[PDB]
Design a protein around this ligand. Structure first.
Ligand SMILES: COc1ccc2c(c1)C(c1ccc(Cl)cc1)=N[C@@H](CC(=O)Nc1ccc(N3CCC([N+](C)(C)C)CC3)cc1)c1nnc(C)n1-2
Length: 110
């Protein structure tokens, strides 16, 4: 399953690519709560995640298996859904990028 981790690296590169940039861009770097005017972000979200952090962990070889990679990507999306109202534009962007992630992850070789 070095081959599964290589497939995961391929997914990450697709999520960061210009093809999906219209809805992926909020997830590129950690949420900057003071830059967005959010006073309570870190009171609600105890474990932040974003694509730059997933990339650093992949480059460092911190992932023991594909399931750990999926847990981080799904955490990133879940924090967005937890913090925001369900009709919010950033939740619509999260769902569009999650559609791409779940479809590619499901096609991973066993
Ligand atoms: C680099 O920019 C970023 C990075 C991370 C996140 C965000 C933006 C964005 C983001 C927002 C909109 C769009 Cl279209 C796209 C993204 N959202 C942030 C979260 C955020 O800010 N939410 C937010 C929600 C509601 C309000 N209020 C506006 C005033 C209203 N009023 C009644 C008039 C008083 C009440 C409701 C304020 C803030 C975020 N969350 N995850 C990620 C990733 N993000």
């Amino acid at each position: 399953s070095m081959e599964q981790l290589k497939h995961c690296n391929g997914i990450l590169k697709e999520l960061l690519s210009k093809k999906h940039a219209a809805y992926a861009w909020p997830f590129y770097k950690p949420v900057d709560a003071s830059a967005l005017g959010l006073h309570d972000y870190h009171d609600i979200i105890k474990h932040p995640m974003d694509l730059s952090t997933v990339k650093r962990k992949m480059e460092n070889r911190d992932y023991r298996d594909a399931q750990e990679f999926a847990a981080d990507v799904r955490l990133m999306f879940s924090n967005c859904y937890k913090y925001n109202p369900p009709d919010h534009d950033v939740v619509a962007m999260a769902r569009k990028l999650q559609d791409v992630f779940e479809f590619r992850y499901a096609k991973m070789p066993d």
